[PDB]
């Protein structure tokens, strides 16, 4: 709907955030219209004065997920912080968690080859993999937690 | 979260394995006819 995108252009930042939440519920159906307006949602995520930055990031990450651009979807999902819940049984969350584990394992593997370049692993990506390993441990799925801990090169979580 | 995180790669690896097998078999048969 071009009515929610128009509400994002208004100076009531809170009302723009409300329009963004309205587009979030509707992100599954309205992603082809929202994709044209990604630069407006990116500008709302970059704006330091906006209290609801994590909700803008979550709408952007859902739009990139429906576009098929999982890397940018992950970068914005890491921007959403507390609004990205690992507990949610959504196809969006599963695909992004799988991609987050793969990127984390790839970065950890490279950081161990290059003894001279500490590839700066985003602490947000580490925190998602931690919560997922803890979920697998709480679910009694120890064999999966061990497989993931071996891929992630995390000896401490393997011991746990 | 283990169901949606770890087991997900089993359904992914097999899809590429199935096409790699067929491509390798086709190339191997093309080379085998010539070798024979």
């Amino acid at each position: 709907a071009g009515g929610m995108l128009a509400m994002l252009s208004e100076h009531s930042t809170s009302l723009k955030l409300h329009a963004l939440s309205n587009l979030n519920v509707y992100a599954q159906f309205l992603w082809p219209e929202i994709s044209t307006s990604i630069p407006l949602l990116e500008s709302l995520y970059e704006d330091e004065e906006f209290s609801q930055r994590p909700l803008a990031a979550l709408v952007v990450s859902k739009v990139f997920y429906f576009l098929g651009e999982l890397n940018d979807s992950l970068a914005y999902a890491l921007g959403a912080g507390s609004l990205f819940d690992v507990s949610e049984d959504s196809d969006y969350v599963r695909t992004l968690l799988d991609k987050a584990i793969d990127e984390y394992a790839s970065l950890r593997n490279k950081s161990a080859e290059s003894k001279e370049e500490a590839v700066n692993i985003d602490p947000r990506l580490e925190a998602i993999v931690e919560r997922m390993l803890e979920k697998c441990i709480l679910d009694g799925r120890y064999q999966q937690a061990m497989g993931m801990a071996i891929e992630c090169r995390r000896l401490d979580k393997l011991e746990e | 979260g283990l169901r949606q995180y770890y087991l997900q790669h089993i359904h992914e690896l097999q899809l590429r394995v199935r096409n790699k097998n067929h491509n390798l078999q086709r190339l191997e048969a093309q080379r085998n006819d010539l070798n024979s």
């Binding site: - | 790699k20 080379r31 070798n35």
Partner: peptide
């Protein structure tokens, strides 16, 4: 065991992957 099915599947897929270079070598030597 539950994680074994994925680890073994990955091992076999990786092993079959080298088959590409294996075949390519003979495709030129032949």
């Amino acid at each position: 065991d539950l994680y074994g099915r994925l680890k073994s599947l990955e091992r076999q897929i990786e092993f079959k992957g080298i088959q590409e270079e294996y075949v390519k070598d003979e495709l030129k030597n032949l």
